[PDB]
Amino acid sequence: MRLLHTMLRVGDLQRSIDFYTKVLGMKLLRTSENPEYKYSLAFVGYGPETEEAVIELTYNWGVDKYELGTAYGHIALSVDNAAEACEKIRQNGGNVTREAGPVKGGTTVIAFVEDPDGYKIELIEEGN
Amino acid sequence: MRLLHTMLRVGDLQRSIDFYTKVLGMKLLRTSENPEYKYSLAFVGYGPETEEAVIELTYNWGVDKYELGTAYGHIALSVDNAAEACEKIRQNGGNVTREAGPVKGGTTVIAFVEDPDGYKIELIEEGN
Ligand code: NI
Ligand code: NI
Incomplete structure (x- = not known):
């Protein structure tokens, strides 16, 4: 077994992709849209999903903000x-x-x- | 560069440790405690920290509940x-x-x- 990814909901997909890739040096591995449920995804990482853990970014159409809470660390x-x-x-x-x-x-x-x-x-x- | 870990605040350290190791099959990789800041940590994963991404379980002394919020995914x-x-x-x-x-x-x-x-x-x- 292995740890595949960590998923985070973001308020603007592109802004997040730009950040992870351009500022942190990751690559955009893949992206998708789910018209039925109105959301888009992007996977960013330093290597292939097959070999290592990456980040899954989720953008729900029309949602620009979430409540961070106090549980999640980093x-x-x-x-x-x-x-x-x-x-x-x-x-x-x-x-x-x-x-x-x-x-x-x-x-x-x-x-x-x-x-x-x-x-x-x-x-x-x-x-x- | 690589993804090192995902940190999650837990309400009960051993309870979390047992779940991730005994139920999920991870191994306890390392632990620590800090009196200044009042917390204890447990790193769990399917491989050592130098080879894989793992999870940092953080227990803040005397805190047994957090607000999950709506941002963090999984x-x-x-x-x-x-x-x-x-x-x-x-x-x-x-x-x-x-x-x-x-x-x-x-x-x-x-x-x-x-x-x-x-x-x-x-x-x-x-x-x-
Ligand atoms: Ni996922
Ligand atoms: Ni950490």
Whole structure:
């Protein structure tokens, strides 16, 4: 068994695709529409769904906002360069909630940011 | 770059750990506790953190309930036997919201369940 994906509802599909791919470096793997139930999907990721976990973005026609709640935490991604991502993210209008820097008591560089819908993302700069 | 984990706040750590490991077949990869911030964590997954995406279960001391909200969707996992999985889940702390079966106009078998805290999980099956 394997973990396939994490699905998040977004208020604007393209805005989200633009962010994940252009700002975070993922690729748009596939997209679909469901006319019957009025929603669209997009899968974004760093590699093929067959080999690894990705993100499923769901856009319900006409719905631009959701209630985030207090349960869901975040998604953590390995980042090539934390500082730069924060910069890209910021200048790209986003919010950096935790500037890049070594984590408390450790050495690993991490940062926290928010996507366009306010979801939190943890960036961690990390057989063979 | 890769997806590292998805973090979910849980009302009872062991309760969550038992569900993901005993019912879903994941393994407990690591744990930690932090007095400053008052929480404990458990990482569960089908492979080590360096090979796969996993789940970060967060238990905030003395907090046993959160607001799920309407934004967060689910986590999808592959399974060998959706029907069997559903049964195991419904009988061990979970709930089945969508019985195993093919998707309209498809043949791929899927189901939707809820874990002990209400989080949705999508089960995707991989001549009887
Ligand atoms: Ni995390
Ligand atoms: Ni899904």
